[PDB]
Amino acid sequence: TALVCDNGSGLVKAGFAGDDAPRAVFPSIVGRPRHQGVMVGMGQKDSYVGDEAQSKRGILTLKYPIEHGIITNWDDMEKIWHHTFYNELRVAPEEHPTLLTEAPLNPKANREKMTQIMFETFNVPAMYVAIQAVLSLYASGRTTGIVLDSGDGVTHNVPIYEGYALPHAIMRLDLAGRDLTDYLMKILTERGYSFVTTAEREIVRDIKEKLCYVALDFENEMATAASSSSLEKSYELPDGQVITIGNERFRCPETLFQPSFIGMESAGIHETTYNSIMKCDIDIRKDLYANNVMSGGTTMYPGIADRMQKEITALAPSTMKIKIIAPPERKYSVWIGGSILASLSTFQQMWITKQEYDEAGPSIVHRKCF
Amino acid sequence: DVTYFVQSLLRDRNEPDSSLKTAERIKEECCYVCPDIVKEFSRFDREPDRYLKYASESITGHSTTIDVGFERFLAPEIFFNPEIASSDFLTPLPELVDNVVQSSPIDVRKGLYKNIVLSGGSTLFKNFGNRLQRDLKRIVDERIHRSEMLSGAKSGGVDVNVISHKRQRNAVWFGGSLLAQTPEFGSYCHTKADYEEYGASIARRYQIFGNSL
Numbered sequence: 172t173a174l175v176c177d178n179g180s181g182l183v184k185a186g187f188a189g190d191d192a193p194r195a196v197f198p199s200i201v202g203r204p205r206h207q208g209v210m211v212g213m214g215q216k217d218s219y220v221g222d223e224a225q226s227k228r229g230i231l232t233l234k235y236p237i238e239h240g241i242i243t244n245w246d247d248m249e250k251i252w253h254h255t256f257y258n259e260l261r262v263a264p265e266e267h268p269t270l271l272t273e274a275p276l277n278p279k280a281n282r283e284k285m286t287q288i289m290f291e292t293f294n295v296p297a298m299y300v301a302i303q304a305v306l307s308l309y310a311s312g313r314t315t316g317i318v319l320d321s322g323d324g325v326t327h328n329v330p331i332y333e334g335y336a337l338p339h340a341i342m343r344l345d346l347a348g349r350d351l352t353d354y355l356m357k358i359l360t361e362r363g364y365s366f367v368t369t370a371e372r373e374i375v376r377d378i379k380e381k382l383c384y385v386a387l388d389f390e391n392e393m394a395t396a397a398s399s400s401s402l403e404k405s406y407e408l409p410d411g412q413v414i415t416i417g418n419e420r421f422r423c424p425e426t427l428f429q430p431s432f433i434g435m436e437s438a439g440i441h442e443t444t445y446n447s448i449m450k451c452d453i454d455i456r457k458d459l460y461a462n463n464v465m466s467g468g469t470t471m472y473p474g475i476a477d478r479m480q481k482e483i484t485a486l487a488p489s490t491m492k493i494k495i496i497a498p499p500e501r502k503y504s505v506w507i508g509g510s511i512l513a514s515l516s517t518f519q520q521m522w523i524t525k526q527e528y529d530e531a532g533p534s535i536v537h538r539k540c541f
Numbered sequence: 542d543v544t545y546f547v548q549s550l551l552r553d554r555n556e557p558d559s560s561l562k563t564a565e566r567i568k569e570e571c572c573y574v575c576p577d578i579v580k581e582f583s584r585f586d587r588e589p590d591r592y593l594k595y596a597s598e599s600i601t602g603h604s605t606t607i608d609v610g611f612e613r614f615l616a617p618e619i620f621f622n623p624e625i626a627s628s629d630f631l632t633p634l635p636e637l638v639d640n641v642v643q644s645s646p647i648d649v650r651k652g653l654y655k656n657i658v659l660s661g662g663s664t665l666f667k668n669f670g671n672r673l674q675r676d677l678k679r680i681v682d683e684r685i686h687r688s689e690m691l692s693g694a695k696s697g698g699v700d701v702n703v704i705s706h707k708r709q710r711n712a713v714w715f716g717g718s719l720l721a722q723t724p725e726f727g728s729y730c731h732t733k734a735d736y737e738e739y740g741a742s743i744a745r746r747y748q749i750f751g752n753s754l
């Protein structure tokens with residue numbers, strides 16, 4: 172059995188090849204205490220990871236070692252991988268080959284450090300670093316499609332046709348669920364609610380995924396919200412205080428379609444999906460429009476597939492079907508795809524074995540992986 | 542100005558709604574012209590159903606209820622005591638209509654009092670034409686009686702008639718329609734051929750007033 176670990180910017184998804192869902196899903200977080208430890212005994216630690224850090228968060232400064240799909244803190248990332256293998260999966264990593272994941276257009280140093288740590292500290296026998304949106308296409312059961320993947324740190328489009336990616340047509344956008352969470356912290360302040368500690372950011376992250384949705388026509392939903400009570404919903408803080416919220420439920424996700432809400436110059440996710448299809452060869456575009464695959468947690472909003480279908484139908488020529496493909500399990504589809512790829516009987520020649528790393532060093536990964 | 546006064550009175554009572562549409566709708570439905578505001582303030586002590594309750598819906602789409610009180614009579618009083626509205630204008634409408642007819646030539650004064658036509662939406666207040674007629678008839682007969690008492694002989698008087706009519710709400714448009722139907726109408730217009738010669742200066746000269754040159 173191989174391991175599959177999808178190193179998300181916000182969640183680790185981890186498990187074994189050939190299983191149909193991840194065994195471990197937990198925050199991609201390390202927390203450290205920020206207050207006086209007055210009491211001796213009673214089960215304390217200098218640091219906490221994942222669900223322990225999420226449960227104790229009132230007393231901790233939380234941080235994510237991933238920013239925009241790049242590992243920015245390697246000592247904390249080792250603590251997350253150690254927690255993944257030894258606490259959450261309960262395996263010796265020296266006994267199992269591991270499939271890892273990253274975003275396209277990442278720094279080469281990210282992939283070099285990620286292969287080095289895995290051989291040189293976890294003693295893994297063989298490992299691989301797949302592109303996240305190539306794995307999401309395996310889970311969808313397809314050879315052709317353009318995959319919009321949006322997680323916690325990155326949004327990316329990669330078009331694939333008959334098993335070939337078009338690497339020049341790949342689009343990347345460093346705007347996803349962390350930027351939507353921080354923009355919800357911004358606009359909750361105008362309703363009178365202040366969220367500022369990194370623990371309060373996790374409350375706003377939970378408000379975002381229980382209350383926010385994508386408006387099919389934003390300017391009509393703004394008019395509807397300005398003239399109705401029916402738009403508004405309430406949320407219970409951990410304090411038992413109840414907040415109430417209205418147009419902020421669809422203004423937050425609309426940042427994906429209008430990145431200028433957070434002061435970005437970027438085109439929206441509909442425009443970058445169309446720009447990626449229009450960078451492809453003219454013969455493949457028909458099959459990419461019919462196979463717009465959506466994946467990752469920032470695609471889980473109510474109404475996002477319908478706004479995405481409406482907007483790409485407004486960009487494309489009217490004579491061919493735009494189909495947005497939005498599986499109900501699409502929040503895990505990168506990990507599902509890694510479980511398929513690591514289970515395929517043709518893949519076992521493609522692993523980087525430690526025997527290759529022992530002669531080539533960490534630069535082996537750039538010639539074994541896409 | 543009577544809407545801004547209604548709005549200002551709702552706002553002085555801190556009523557749940559004082560939006561401009563709600564002050565407008567309280568003029569059209571609740572307001573009327575009384576004989577005298579100190580007697581009518583006293584009637585709002587003597588009789589309790591003089592205060593109305595007005596149901597209004599907010600800009601953000603929920604119900605409210607407004608108590609409407611002395612603005613029912615005090616707001617239409619703006620025409621009959623403009624010192625309520627303004628520092629800059631002081632003469633009440635019945636005295637102002639007297640000043641129009643007494644500055645006008647003597648042979649047309651019976652005709653000008655015999656036919657005082659009301660026009661425009663803000664003349665539609667309940668009892669407005671009756672307050673104007675009685676207060677102007679008072680001004681007119683006090684002026685005639687000063688002359689009868691000097692001369693020792695009774696006059697024929699003058700009938701003051703204030704006229705409210707079925708087209709009063711839009712009388713300017715209905716008149717414009719009736720006058721533009723005339724066979725001669727196209728001869729009173731500026732034609733674009735006049736404008737091609739003289740430009741916008743063709744329309745500059747006052748029609749209603751006496752011009753020099």
Ligand SMILES: Nc1ncnc2c1ncn2[C@@H]1O[C@H](COP(=O)(O)OP(=O)(O)O)[C@@H](O)[C@H]1O
Pocket residue numbers: 178179180181182183199321322323324325347348349352376379380381466467468469471472502
């Ligand atoms: N149901 C949801 N609705 C909206 N946002 C969600 C939802 N579920 C998760 N998210 C957001 O998506 C991100 C987690 O999705 P995931 O695909 O696991 O991202 P990643 O792999 O990069 O860590 C977080 O930023 C979270 O705020």
Ligand SMILES: [Mg+2]
Pocket residue numbers: 178179180181321322323324467
């Ligand atoms: Mg991710």
